[model samples]
Target: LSVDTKFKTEGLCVDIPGIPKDMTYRRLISMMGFYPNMFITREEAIRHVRAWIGFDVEGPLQLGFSTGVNLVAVGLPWNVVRIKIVQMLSDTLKNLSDRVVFVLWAHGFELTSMKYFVKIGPERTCCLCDRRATCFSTASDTYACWHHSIGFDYVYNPFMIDVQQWGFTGNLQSNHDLYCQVHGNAHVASCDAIMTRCLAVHECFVKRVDWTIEYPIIGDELKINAACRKVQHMVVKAALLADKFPVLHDIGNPKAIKCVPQADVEWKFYDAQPCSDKAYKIEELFFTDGVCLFWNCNVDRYPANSIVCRFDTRVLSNLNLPGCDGGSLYVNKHAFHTPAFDKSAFVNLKQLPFFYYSDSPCVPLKSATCITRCNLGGAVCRHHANEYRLYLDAYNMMISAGFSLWVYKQFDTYNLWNTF
Candidate 1:
């Protein structure tokens, strides 16, 4: 199953003026292989949407997406580390015009496999350890912490779609050939994330969809073009800031952990201040999510600080937990986009209620509801387990009868703006 439709390969080439000392153009190109002939600048990427896909939209949508996994043993049986899926796109669901979504092959399996990303430190989770560093997973899935249940804030009810159900099945390597323009030995974290985006663009938006079990297209080409443009900007900006690293700690307010940009980098930094202070220019601010502050402030000013501050109630402004405006506590594993070996800026989450309370005994539910949901055309079913089948079943069952199962959404919701 191939689109066979040749997407334009001749267009504005991706250009990054400054790269890290250790990084090379060839290496950077490989990291950015998912987006081919991307516009030279983010603005161009927005404007060139119609040229690339023959459509347009008012603005870009937001997406909370991840790839890859890792396992960790906090080294203690009683105080086990747990994986928590932070719903970054929850804010976008409030606005009707601004759409957002995400997809996970197996949320339960992936989160458990990644092992809560609590290994590195308080500054970041494991996903930020590499440039394209998202999350990572393994076959065993629960080798380190077998009894813990994964945490998530999917109450907002976002949308998700699957590739295998769409007939484009296989791992990242084989799927890339069918959907993406670039293909390679791509089981790595960054490549898998890029491939995920490529798969989203093709499966949900571009590919012919006469056959449908679940309808993939919720919006017309204009809206989807807006989404693709937003995603493209995220990729381009991610590449540009790939080298710059920030350090966050749990020393201050748990809700507002002060994140300082590393002094060694070429980018300039201002005196650290409260995220509410307008004294600091928004453009100069960078979030813990590895995104420049300029792009997404309007969408959600609270999360604009960085993933570090958004934990618990620190960055939620007025939004409370388990509600529309509520937020979740994330286990900061390490600084986003740094080497896992660097351990200088670890944060201690023991004091934080969200992180501390999660250390409960792990056990399967007696009368559980399946939290995994994926669209197989029109029919929705419990997720098809990955390598860790039995383990995922236990992981997938929700023990909390008090709370109804929230279907995790699978769509892209990237927030990027024109800031060259």
Candidate 2:
């Protein structure tokens, strides 16, 4: 029935690839990702294996097999079945035929060298019965058994081997010999007929649809860090701004500051409303009355009243930044200047235009503070202060280590700055 492996042969004339010739059973099992129980019976294997071919050799090493009706052996003239086998192996056994299989024992040398003596024209003899042999013919799928011919099943099927090791280690072939002796067989083609049948039925030797293992990716964290590094500078700048200035109202709020960009600040293409036809005489504060900020009053091409700079803000929730906890940064997509056209240089927030400030006496009179305008002692002010602190800490770390994609999206998707 089943030859239990404490671990885990056959043949008719057969055709093999996959594992390297020198691959050990242990290595084979390791690569396959699972171990197979090799003791299945022929009756059990009947449904799984289409045909079981066995192989063995003698002479300068001759290959032999029993055709069920005839016994045949082929002698080498001079050539590796190499070229033909390389093609066969490339086809993979399943592509050749799912059902056909081979049975062999201690297949190392015989399997590896079989490629050398693959072709025989007409002259050949049976190593066992010492009878005249027949050459393989593709026209008719049959070979002479002795005087009778048997169907050749499928040409060159996959070979299965007696894989159980004695003592877990020893001469590979000698250990295989022990298995044959203990199970009932010898090292000859005729006897191998029985060995092949026994091995062919085993459940373990049955062909499986899946024969490979997939390994998991291990560099994901490193990849994320690398991405974060790419946007660190941007995150730091945004975080520093957020730490100093709180978002008082959303971008289009009437009380928001109205000024033209003094420096060549990048604009967010999708959301930015630039005063296309007008040219500003100075990058300074313009008039605003909950409608628009007119940068130039005398521009003739486009009415100054029609040219309003619409600053924008966006919540970058899709960024890949884990360092900032999950808090997304609120970015001012457009930056503008304050005061007159001194054009000395771009100073800190002190020189930047101011948004409307709260009438509350507790509020700082600083220009950046005008954005939030929160009274310091109020509950809302305390809450926003904590958020600002968190922003500062997160941005500081990003400056040193790195930031997240969430931060970069604001910079990249909207043309913020081209620092890096």
For each candidate in turn, the TM-score is 0.22, 0.22
Find the candidate with the highest TM-score and give its number.
2
Candidate 2 C-alpha error for residue 134, in Å:
19
lDDT of 2: 0.30
Superposed by TM-score, candidate 1 places the C-alpha of residue 311 at a distance from the truth, in angstroms, of 36
* lDDT string, candidate 2, 1-420, tens digits: 222222221111232334343544444433323213222333333333323444554434444442322222333233333323223323332221232334555434344444342323344443333434322324463333222222222122223444332122543233334423323344555355444443332222222211232212222333433433322332333332333222111122233231222212232111122222122333332221111212212111221212222111121121211011111111112111111111221111111221122222334222233223353322336445554444444434433322212111112211222111
Model 1: lDDT equals 0.25
* Candidate 1 runs further than 4 Å off: 1-64, 67-84, 91-101, 106-108, 111-159, 182-186, 209-420
Q: Among all windows of ten consecutive residues in candidate 2, which has the lowest summed lDDT?
A: 320-329
**What lDDT score is found at residue 26 in candidate 1?**
33
Report, for all candidates in order, the number of backbone clashes: 35, 21
